[PDB]
Amino acid sequence: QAKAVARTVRIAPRKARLVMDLIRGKQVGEAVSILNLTPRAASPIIEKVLKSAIANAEHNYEMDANNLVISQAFVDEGPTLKRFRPRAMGRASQINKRTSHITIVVSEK
């Protein structure tokens, strides 16, 4: 089994989990197509992580790109950046720019 993690990605975790739920459990080749055809802003990032996981599986563990399936796929919370004065244009206060840790594990079926 092979793993690939993307840390402190500038995306809200709640919005990334929507796509993560779509792709988990699927065959690894089919999952790429779903990510390519989903119109969300987390798709490109999750696709990069998935491609990285597939690469590690072939160059480091000599497993084949076929017969691979997504075992685990989850999103965690990352350090939050706090903008106290969105006074620029906005009349809000202490906006929170959230962040995510994206993890994908693949293995042979």
Partner: protein, 45 residues
């Protein structure tokens, strides 16, 4: 119009049950093996 009380975890999770995405409608390109949205174009496929 002021929340009288905080919302529990279970009620939040229950309300968020219809807030999810749908698997796309994809077909495989006759020539090539690329996948595109049905009724979309891909001669380059």
């Amino acid at each position: 119009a002021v929340p009288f009380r905080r919302t529990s975890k279970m009620k939040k999770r229950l309300r968020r049950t219809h807030f999810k995405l749908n698997v796309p409608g994809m077909t495989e390109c006759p020539s090539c093996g690329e996948m595109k949205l049905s009724h979309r174009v891909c001669k380059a496929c």
